Structure 1
């Protein structure tokens, strides 16, 4: 495994947990309260979820040259039920993603990229690749 080698769900699942063990990520004190998207029906069932998003994002950046919060809000953004009106896109929160981006920096997984947008760092690039291997290794099944 390149991270590209591992399936997205298991990769994210494994990394997100690894982050949880590490114990040092950092977390707008909120996260209990927050929905994550105006579109959103209820907050996240796994109140633990902050880690999962972080993993998801780290993987998301590693794939691509550089990305920023607006893109993430939309990615997270689902369809919002206008009620009487037909449903439409609504890019998902900007505080969570930003905080995610800021926090990741602390670990050095990602760093400000040139010309705007955060890019993965070689430190992160190394870190993701390492867990990617661990996941591949676990088993067949």
Structure 2
């Protein structure tokens, strides 16, 4: 039959889309990126090198579910806590550089769209007909493979 992302643990899906962008390398890992600068304010720089792909990879999964979500919100929505040391841990906001880039790139990719209608969040990013189709394919491919595990 057919399955959407809602039918596949995305922790699993992103592990799939992360690559579909690799082989296709439709993107272009910006400068500051590789230039070591972990997201937010943490300890060590990421370990997995393709974090760039993974971030966007999921960012698509996120936007495909919460259309109109924004920069400063996704910035939060990623989920981060900070060991200030003596002072307890406070919740932390992410990075707006890597983040806003990823949305622009997904837009050039014809997957993301800037709505110029809803007067609240004018220009927020949303899935596109072509854009979301690409997703269900990855999903269904994974879906079918899970059912394949006889």
Q: Is 1:119 matched with 2:121?
A: no
Q: Hey, what does 2:13 align to over in structure 1?
A: 11
Partners of 1:129 and 1:75 lie apart in 2 by: 23
Q: Is 1:36 matched with 2:39?
A: yes
User: Could you say which structure has the larger radius of gyration?
Assistant: 2
Q: Report the TM-score, using the length of structure 2 for normalisation.
A: 0.87
Question: Which consecutive unaligned segments of at least 5 residues does structure 1 have?
Answer: none
Q: Hey, what does 1:50 align to over in structure 2?
A: 52
User: How far does residue 48 in structure 1 lie from its aligned partner after superposition?
Assistant: 1.4
Q: What SS is found at the alignment partner of 1:63?
A: coil
Partners of 1:63 and 1:76 lie apart in 2 by: 14
Partners of 1:29 and 1:107 lie apart in 2 by: 19
Q: Hey, what does 1:22 align to over in structure 2?
A: 24
Q: Hey, what does 1:94 align to over in structure 2?
A: 96
Q: Hey, what does 1:73 align to over in structure 2?
A: 75
The worse-fitting range, judged by mean Cα deviation, of 50-59 and 18-27 is 18-27
Instruction: Name the count of aligned residue pairs.
Output: 140
Question: Which consecutive unaligned segments of at least 5 residues does structure 2 have?
Answer: 117-121
Q: Hey, what does 2:140 align to over in structure 1?
A: 133
Partners of 2:48 and 2:115 lie apart in 1 by: 31
Q: Report the TM-score, using the length of structure 1 for normalisation.
A: 0.92
Deviations 1:13-59 (CA, angstroms, capped at 9, x unpaired): 11111111111112212322121112x21121012111101111000
Deviations 1:83-137 (CA, angstroms, capped at 9, x unpaired): 1111111111000110111111110110112324211111111110111111112
